[PDB]
Amino acid sequence: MTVSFQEIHPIEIDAQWPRQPFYGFSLDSRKVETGQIFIALTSYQPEKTRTFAEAALANGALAVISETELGVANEWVCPDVRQRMGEWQKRYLQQADVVKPLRIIAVTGTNGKTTISRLIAELISSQQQRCAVMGTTGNGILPNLTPHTTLDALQLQNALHDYAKQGATFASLEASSHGLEQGRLNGCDIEIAVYSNLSRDHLYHGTLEAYAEAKARLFQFNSLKVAVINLDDAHADLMIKSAQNNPAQPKILTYSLTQNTADYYIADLDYSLAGATFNLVSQQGSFAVESPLLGHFNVENLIAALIAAEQAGFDLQALVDFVPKLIGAPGRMQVIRDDERLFVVDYAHTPDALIQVLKTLKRHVSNQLWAVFGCGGDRDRGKRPLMTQAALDGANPVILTSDNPRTEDPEQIFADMKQGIDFSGHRMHEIHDRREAIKFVAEQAQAGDIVVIAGKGHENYQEINGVRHWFDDVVEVRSAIDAQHHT
Numbered sequence: 001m002t003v004s005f006q007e008i009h010p011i012e013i014d015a016q017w018p019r020q021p022f023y024g025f026s027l028d029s030r031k032v033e034t035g036q037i038f039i040a041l042t043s044y045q046p047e048k049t050r051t052f053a054e055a056a057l058a059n060g061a062l063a064v065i066s067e068t069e070l071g072v073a074n075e076w077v078c079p080d081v082r083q084r085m086g087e088w089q090k091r092y093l094q095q096a097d098v099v100k101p102l103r104i105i106a107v108t109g110t111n112g113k114t115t116i117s118r119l120i121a122e123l124i125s126s127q128q129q130r131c132a133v134m135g136t137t138g139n140g141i142l143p144n145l146t147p148h149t150t151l152d153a154l155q156l157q158n159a160l161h162d163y164a165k166q167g168a169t170f171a172s173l174e175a176s177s178h179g180l181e182q183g184r185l186n187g188c189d190i191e192i193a194v195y196s197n198l199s200r201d202h203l204y205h206g207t208l209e210a211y212a213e214a215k216a217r218l219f220q221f222n223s224l225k226v227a228v229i230n231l232d233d234a235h236a237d238l239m240i241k242s243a244q245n246n247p248a249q250p251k252i253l254t255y256s257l258t259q260n261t262a263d264y265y266i267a268d269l270d271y272s273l274a275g276a277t278f279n280l281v282s283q284q285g286s287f288a289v290e291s292p293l294l295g296h297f298n299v300e301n302l303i304a305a306l307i308a309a310e311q312a313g314f315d316l317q318a319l320v321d322f323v324p325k326l327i328g329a330p331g332r333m334q335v336i337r338d339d340e341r342l343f344v345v346d347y348a349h350t351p352d353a354l355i356q357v358l359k360t361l362k363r364h365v366s367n368q369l370w371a372v373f374g375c376g377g378d379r380d381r382g383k384r385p386l387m388t389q390a391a392l393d394g395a396n397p398v399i400l401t402s403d404n405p406r407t408e409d410p411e412q413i414f415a416d417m418k419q420g421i422d423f424s425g426h427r428m429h430e431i432h433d434r435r436e437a438i439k440f441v442a443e444q445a446q447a448g449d450i451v452v453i454a455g456k457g458h459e460n461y462q463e464i465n466g467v468r469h470w471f472d473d474v475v476e477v478r479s480a481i482d483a484q485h486h487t
Contacts, residue, residue, distance in 0.1 A: 003092060005020075018063075026061070027152055033060065039085055041067055084183075086154070086187030090187040093157060100164065104171050105194070106218060108175040117135050119302060124314065134156070152184065181210075193221065193228065197300075215235075219242040220242050222247050230256075240252060276289075278299065342361075343442070345477065346452055347454075347458070354390045358394030372454065392428075399441060403455040406464070442484065
């Protein structure tokens, strides 16, 4: 089809360009194609904007729609274009190359967006549908994803359209607060919305009410069929009320780990080296879940994902049966399983970070939770015993080892780490060579143990004497484990 702007969003204007063929919208004056219409967002250097719009006209743009008066030719001033442009681009694509629409699920929340998003995609895909996922670990059809920081509304519509062209019947999206405020999802006919949580720490520049209200905007979409809302969260009520005030009157579903009044809750939860087991209880009965995922947050995330996928027309029992096969999202922990032991390589560079991963893993450990760690050289000597204290408070045994000692005398580093510390009642070893420490725990840890190797994560060097030597914790763990199965 030939497509004109009048068919997308008709206007009264003394100009012929709205009646002409155009080839979609663009936010990029450099790479705008000929006969595309340029959208001139005022780019808060306001004087840059007019030059961008002029460059775009020079590169073949048919016209310019701007938030403000810019004095360019073939111009239409539309102050809220930032909020309508996703819809306009979707309309353009359905005019030019009509496809059957995707069914769109979106999750909003400070934490869990990626995990819930991907679990939803994985469940729906397990039921032989094809599901697209779009977020900070990638974009596309399971399993190949495209990992721009995040997409503008036009790019969102172009990708959603491409996925429909390729067979996807569903898409699972993350919805950040800034994204919602900016109109980035406005073109989307969002069927199911999920709310995970809201947390005081975010790095979003506004008052907390603006952050929460940005999120509530997701539940005002008149596309909304179902709202899936985490009851255990302080701002649940805000989300709920918007769902109630939605003209489309979507169905509201609450979930809770504790309160049995929510539409969904859980019974008899417990943890293990395999993950977690619990009963997911709803009006339709009880379902025994065998999750392969670590941590309490992932019980929450899995609950939200299962509900959203059910609400998409799939049977709860089939999804629950698929759960043991769920992969999840790449995280802060690198987990190596061997002979009923978990080895967890993790950046845990401060006392708080070490204690947090130890608290998570202590839920799962069957026998002993080990911590292996060191303290960087040529750094604050006063923080070293605090690291040791944190390890002792959360793990036993603990292994004191080396981590980027640099030019500092190792004896001083280790003396510092031990300053004022009482090791009575703890199994402690001090193993200066790091490769030696990892070999030690690899051999010594028993069935039901979890071993945290902290301090490096993906950092693949060990700095000594000014020299960064190749050193990878995961490589050493897997070597040692391999050496154990070998003669």
